[PDB]
Design a protein around this nucleic acid. Structure first.
Lengths: 63, 127, 317, 37, 206, 103
RNA sequence: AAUAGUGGUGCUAGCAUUUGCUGGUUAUCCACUUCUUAGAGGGACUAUCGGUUUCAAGCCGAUGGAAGUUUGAGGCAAUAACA
């Protein structure tokens, strides 16, 4: 299966109608030069492992 | 005369005084052996101070504890507060400190609330 | 050739800061140690360059910071001066103290014992000086200062007990006064320190009196001429002091390390400066109390992070 | 009894003082009751 | 191993391997098993346990929440409605009557059958919990791992209540078959077949 | 020359440690046998009453308090020693009692 | 501290008995305050280190600590049309 093994680097801020989701900076482990953001929902901190499917199609920002 | 000390342990207004004496080794919970406490599921919570250091240091001891107060659940927590801190008074009056700290480190590595009781009292309502 | 001091051990038995260590003249195998954390700890000097073994006793009897501990030459008893107006007469075997004291209004700051074992002097932070019996009775209060007091010292009477005992005090009014016991009187007024006097010790001969305060003004005094021979500027803050018992080396415990001098001439042998880890460099730990051997061949140093290190006086190569 | 201030009900029968509670709030000081918590 | 005696007549069977580094009265913690890279950090609290009951202080900062044991967590979730709020002693009776009925069902480690089970049931994708501002839509989103474990365990639990509501079978009979169903990827249990269809429409919406 | 017992149950705690001090003062200047002032658990009074004269408005209440402290001393003395000193330790708000119970 | 409690000395019953573990109560008497109650004081200040920020006010971790969410909860505090 196409796994996407990811590691959060920097936290940026909550965004949303309620701020229920958070935009962070995440890194890919298998390619350590992948600077990309991700709209992760939940309590987040440094140094987490992020399962993921759609490796490219992601909203860079929200209203 | 005999080496003898007193400790006590509390949880949620439930006290448990302890009398330490020296002898073949009898552990008396309010006039009964310790292997008969009625919350049968929590029977091993009282075994935890004994089953951390080995069954060795007790052919020279005698333990009589008695409790008041609390419910049927807190008194299980109260007895193992006074018992576990009851053993160190030998080793802080008679036996040396290197023997003291090795089990001091052994207890508080496993349970901070085996030595220090909790601090979570209740609260008044609609006032 | 010279006294180099290599690291010989490390003690970890406290969680305050140490306040006074104490060695026995008779027994060379133990160390009395007091600290800020309301504890008294007596050690076992297991000579080993990996550690020193056993803190053989603990003494749970007080309620606040203790300041200075003293004992006998052979190691028979022990005394303690904690901040809550309390003085305790300890044994050395069991832990059982004898009698508490009701005599002051402040922190009892410094005490001392005569070698004849009859009187115990006490200077406390309520600008008064008190003397006590062996059973612990009041004899006479003593006034004269107007600021606090830090250290009081009895003279080493090495002249075969020729009725010569006198008490020298480290006040807080930039003042160093000398107090007789046999006639109960002021003896000499020492003038010259410009700030808060921090520590004073005299020579092991009882002849050369050193005094040094907050500015780092090591002002030497004599026992009889009582003059300002040496006025050393330690250019720092010094906390406590150190005299080699057998040799003629006088040392000081500054906040910036550990400095040592010879009597004559002026030999800055070493700076005893230990090593730490993990610090922004405005945060290096430093010692406040230090002590010699019974033969001046080992030196102890307790620090703020509860480490007590030891060295040995071997010759320089 | 009806003591004073349009009350014969809500009397404080406890502690044997028998005061209409409308006329207790203004008399509870000099009896020696005071609120603290 | 050398059963010493006291003036208390102590039974030997609480001293055989319990004085040895095996801790729990019937199982151990040598069996460490990592399946996902997310679970490597916090779920298997490497500490001993005997009864799975203590007064944890984890509810006053959201990451001390992680350090409580897994077995303690599942018992906490058994207080479900206005009949079992506070019957913790009832719950631990249920749980210690379930590992026995696990291992007699042709397997090797009763604590293993749940730690692999939550690997499947941590939902890798998600919807969003927003309408969208009139257009009640569902946009691109993913889940934090510490949030992932929370809903992972809880949906396994709630299926067992109606599985044991009003039918002859007991709770321990439900929790047996549910977790071994949850142990593999079968989607035959309600503990699985409601998290799956969440993820399938999440493969649509985004 | 009889064992006696004194009680004092007052409500001004500052004006009960002056009285209990001068009780043990003049007894010890005559050095009688005594046992120290045993201090009992205090008693509090309370009455909840809602805070409106009429009834029209939101609802929470008051709570009033009154504190009673009580301590007592046992004593033995010749009667001429005690019958004078119990008449010079008066103070308003303070109650004094003598009990000579020797059953 | 017989208007709380244990610790013995006893009178005293069991006692597997055999050293022993449970009892015995007014007054058998003495010695005790840890638990208990109430006076007098003490103790925490965000302490000490690591990050972060105009390096400021502060906010996050950390180990110690009975206690580190204003330490937990209350009491007390007047501008106004409910005639």
């Amino acid at each position: 299966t196409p796994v996407t093994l990811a590691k959060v680097i920097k936290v940026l801020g909550r965004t949303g109608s309620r701020g229920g989701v958070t935009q962070v900076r995440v890194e890919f482990l298998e390619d350590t030069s992948r600077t990309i953001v991700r709209n992760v929902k939940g309590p987040v901190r440094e140094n987490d492992i992020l399962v993921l499917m759609e490796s490219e199609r992601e909203a860079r920002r929200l209203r | 005369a005999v080496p003898s000390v007193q400790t006590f342990g509390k949880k949620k207004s439930a006290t448990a005084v302890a009398h330490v004496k020296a002898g073949k080794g009898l552990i008396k919970v309010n006039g009964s052996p310790i292997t008969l406490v009625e919350p049968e599921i929590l029977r091993f919570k009282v075994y935890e101070p004994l089953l951390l250091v080995g069954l060795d240091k007790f052919s020279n001891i005698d333990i009589r504890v008695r409790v008041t107060g609390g419910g049927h659940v807190s008194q299980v927590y109260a007895i193992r507060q006074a018992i576990a801190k009851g053993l160190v008074a030998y080793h802080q009056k008679y036996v040396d400190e290197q023997s003291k700290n090795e089990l001091k480190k052994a207890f508080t590595s496993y349970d901070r609330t085996l030595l220090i009781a909790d601090s979570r009292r209740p609260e008044p309502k609609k006032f | 050739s010279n006294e180099v001091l290599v690291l010989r051990g490390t003690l970890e038995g406290h969680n305050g800061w140490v306040t006074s260590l104490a060695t026995s003249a008779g027994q060379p195998n133990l160390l009395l140690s007091a600290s800020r954390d309301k504890t008294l700890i007596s050690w076992k000097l297991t000579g080993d360059d990996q550690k020193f073994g056993v803190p053989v006793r603990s003494f749970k009897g007080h309620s606040h910071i203790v300041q200075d501990c003293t004992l006998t030459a052979d190691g028979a008893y022990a005394l303690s001066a904690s901040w809550d107006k309390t003085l305790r007469l300890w044994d050395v075997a069991t832990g059982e103290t004898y009698q508490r004291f009701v005599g002051h209004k402040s922190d009892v700051m410094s005490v001392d014992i005569d070698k004849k074992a009859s009187m115990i002097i006490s200077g406390s932070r309520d600008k008064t000086i008190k003397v006590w019996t062996i059973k612990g009775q009041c004899l006479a209060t003593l006034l004269g200062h107007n600021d606090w007091v830090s250290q009081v010292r009895v003279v080493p009477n090495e002249k075969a007990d020729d009725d010569s005992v006198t008490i020298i005090s480290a006040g807080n009014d930039k003042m160093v006064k000398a107090w007789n016991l046999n006639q109960f009187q002021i003896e000499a007024d020492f003038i010259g320190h410009n700030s808060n006097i921090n520590t004073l010790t005299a020579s092991p001969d009882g002849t050369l009196i050193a005094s040094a305060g907050k500015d780092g003004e090591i002002m030497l005094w004599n026992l009889a001429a009582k003059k300002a021979m040496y006025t050393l500027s330690a250019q720092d803050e010094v906390f406590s002091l150190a005299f080699s018992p057998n040799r003629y080396w006088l040392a000081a415990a500054t906040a910036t390390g550990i400095k040592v001098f010879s009597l004559d001439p002026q030999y800055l042998v070493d700076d005893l400066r230990p090593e730490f880890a993990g610090y922004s460099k405005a945060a290096e730990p430093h010692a406040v109390s230090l002590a010699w051997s019974a033969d001046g061949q080992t030196l102890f140093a307790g620090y703020t992070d509860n480490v007590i290190r030891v060295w040995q006086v071997m010759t320089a190569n | 009894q009806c003591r004073v201030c349009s009350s014969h009900t809500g009397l404080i029968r406890k502690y044997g003082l028998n005061i209409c509670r409308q006329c207790f709030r203004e008399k509870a000081n000099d009896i020696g009751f005071n609120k603290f918590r | 191993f050398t059963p010493v005696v006291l003036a208390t007549p102590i039974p030997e069977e609480v001293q055989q391997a319990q004085t040895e580094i095996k801790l729990f009265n019937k199982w151990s913690f040598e069996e460490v098993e990592v399946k996902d890279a997310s679970l490597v950090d916090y779920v298997q609290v490497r500490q001993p346990i005997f009864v799975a009951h203590t007064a944890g202080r984890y509810a006053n900062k959201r990451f001390r929440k992680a350090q409580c044991p897994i077995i303690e967590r599942l018992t906490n979730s058994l207080m479900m409605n206005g009949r079992n709020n506070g019957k913790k002693l009832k719950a631990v009776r249920i749980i210690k009557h379930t590992l026995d009925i696990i291992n007699v069902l042709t397997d090797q480690n009763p604590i293993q059958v749940v730690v692999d089970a939550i690997t499947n049931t941590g939902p890798r994708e998600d919807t969003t919990r927003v309408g969208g501002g009139g257009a009640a839509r569902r946009q691109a989103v993913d889940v934090s791992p510490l949030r992932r474990v929370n809903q992972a365990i809880a949906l396994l639990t709630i299926g067992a209540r109606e599985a044991a509501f009003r039918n002859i079978k007991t709770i321990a009979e439900t929790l047996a078959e549910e977790l071994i169903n949850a142990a593999k990827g079968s989607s035959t249990s309600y503990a699985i077949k409601k998290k799956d269809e969440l993820e399938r429409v999440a493969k649509s919406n985004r | 020359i009889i064992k006696i017992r004194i009680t004092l149950t007052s409500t001004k705690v500052k004006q009960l440690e002056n009285v209990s001090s001068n009780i043990v003062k003049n007894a010890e200047q005559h050095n009688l046998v005594k046992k120290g002032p045993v201090r009992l658990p205090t008693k509090v009074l309370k009455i909840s009453t809602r805070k409106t004269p009429n009834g029209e408005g939101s609802k929470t209440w008051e709570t009033y308090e009154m504190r009673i402290h009580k301590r007592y001393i046992d004593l033995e003395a010749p009667v001429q020693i005690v019958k004078r000193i119990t008449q010079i330790t008066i103070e308003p708000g303070v109650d004094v009692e003598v009990v000579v119970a020797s059953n």
